[PDB]
Amino acid sequence: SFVEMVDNLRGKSGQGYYVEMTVGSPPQTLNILVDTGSSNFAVGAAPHPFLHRYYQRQLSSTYRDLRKGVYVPYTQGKWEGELGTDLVSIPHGPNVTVRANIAAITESDKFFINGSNWEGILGLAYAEIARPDDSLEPFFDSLVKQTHVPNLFSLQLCGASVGGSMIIGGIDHSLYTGSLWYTPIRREWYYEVIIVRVEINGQDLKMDCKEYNYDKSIVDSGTTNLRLPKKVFEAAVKSIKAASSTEKFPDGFWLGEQLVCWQAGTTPWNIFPVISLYLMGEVTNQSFRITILPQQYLRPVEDVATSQDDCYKFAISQSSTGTVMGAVIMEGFYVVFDRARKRIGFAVSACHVHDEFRTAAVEGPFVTLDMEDCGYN
Numbered sequence: 001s002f003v004e005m006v007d008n009l010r011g012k013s014g015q016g017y018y019v020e021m022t023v024g025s026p027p028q029t030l031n032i033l034v035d036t037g038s039s040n041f042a043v044g045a046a047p048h049p050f051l052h053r054y055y056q057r058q059l060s061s062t063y064r065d066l067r068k069g070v071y072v073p074y075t076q077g078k079w080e081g082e083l084g085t086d087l088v089s090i091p092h093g094p095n096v097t098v099r100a101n102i103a104a105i106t107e108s109d110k111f112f113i114n115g116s117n118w119e120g121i122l123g124l125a126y127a128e129i130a131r132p133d134d135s136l137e138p139f140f141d142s143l144v145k146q147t148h149v150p151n152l153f154s155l156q157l158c159g160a161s162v163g164g165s166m167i168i169g170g171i172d173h174s175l176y177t178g179s180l181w182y183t184p185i186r187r188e189w190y191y192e193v194i195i196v197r198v199e200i201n202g203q204d205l206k207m208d209c210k211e212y213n214y215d216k217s218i219v220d221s222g223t224t225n226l227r228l229p230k231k232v233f234e235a236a237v238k239s240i241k242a243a244s245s246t247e248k249f250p251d252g253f254w255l256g257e258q259l260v261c262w263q264a265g266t267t268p269w270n271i272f273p274v275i276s277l278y279l280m281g282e283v284t285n286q287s288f289r290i291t292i293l294p295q296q297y298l299r300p301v302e303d304v305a306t307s308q309d310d311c312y313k314f315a316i317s318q319s320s321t322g323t324v325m326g327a328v329i330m331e332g333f334y335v336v337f338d339r340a341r342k343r344i345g346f347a348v349s350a351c352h353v354h355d356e357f358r359t360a361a362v363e364g365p366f367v368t369l370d371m372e373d374c375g376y377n
């Protein structure tokens with residue numbers, strides 16, 4: 001019955017992927033950002049310049065106030081509001097209704113995005129990182145406890161304005177090609193994984209693999225960019241600069257500030273390298289790699305002039321909180337969040353990204369010794 005959930009995601013580039021949901025009785029429809037990088041379900045519940053609608057608790061007969069406050073500080077953006085519960089459904093999801101915790105957002109700061117077309121956020125990670133604390137049961141845990149829905153979901157996020165699928169409760173085999181490759185979830189708080197090797201155009205970065213996971217590596221659909229720890233970011237940018245040194249770009253470009261443009265259809269894709277991230281596998285001394293194309297980490301943005309150029313921003317940026325495999329890594333891959341078996345699967349997506357002479361890939365098996373030493377303690 002997964003076909004009903006195919007193409008249930010929409011979004012704008014750089015502004016996330018959202019799914020339609022209803023809260024309350026009678027049901028109020030809202031678009032909700034799908035975020036595997038957090039664990040709170042929260043919706044606008046008061047007027048805001050960027051909101052065209054919001055949750056009106058007084059209009060819902062099933063709303064229950066929990067008489068407790070809450071706030072969540074993200075890397076960028078934060079909101080505060082009031083905790084309560086209400087009935088929640090996903091129209092293009094499983095045919096069930098659950099009573100879930102809901103943070104009613106009363107104040108926010110750089111949380112809502114102008115024109116994003118979503119009014120709330122669905123944190124799909126584990127209770128350990130829920131606010132105020134891990135006693136606030138996350139939505140997916142409620143879903144699994146109250147229904148027969150299997151304890152897993154999969155995300156197919158597609159690039160070019162964008163669409164995708166969140167398959168709740170399973171894997172839809174029409175959404176990917178080739179084999180699924182699984183990496184262990186290291187610990188159930190974020191979807192934390194372990195990167196064991198990095199190559200750029202087939203050249204090993206040659207860092208202590210702990211640097212790749214300092215202080216963690218997570219899979220985060222709520223984040224746009226691939227974000228890399230400072231030392232790894234620097235090495236990666238140096239390598240990518242060298243490979244593309246045929247052309248020169250302003251430093252603002254490499255900092256993700258300035259966009260670069262070329263005449264429509266003349267984008268020099270080949271001067272930008274492929275990036276391979278090797279992830280810890282399921283058996284001893286075994287790993288696999290996912291390979292990212294420049295079409296993924298050069299994010300398409302709207303033309304700043306009145307011309308018909310192709311313009312892009314560099315969608316790899318520096319992090320001080322570990323590696324973040326955001327939407328530009330997930331795009332073109334089918335990613336299975338197999339909570340039941342504490343593992344995350346990757347396969348080439350049916351909406352895989354195109355290049356004339358190169359292709360995004362998930363490949364294995366590889367042998368990698370001492371993968372345990374790659375985890376940061």
Ligand SMILES: CCOC[C@@H](Oc1cc(C[C@@H]2CS(=O)(=O)C[C@H](NCc3cccc(C(C)(C)C)c3)[C@H]2O)cc(F)c1N)C(F)(F)F
Pocket residue numbers: 014015016017033035037038039072073074075076077078110111112113116129130220221222223224
């Ligand atoms: C403008 C760029 O955003 C586009 C971005 O919009 C947002 C997305 C998020 C979710 C965040 C994005 S992040 O970059 O802050 C990383 C984080 N996950 C790791 C993390 C870091 C710090 C703290 C926590 C908690 C929640 C566990 C405490 C979790 C995610 O959840 C919060 C926001 F406000 C905005 N607007 C989107 F549109 F979704 F692409």
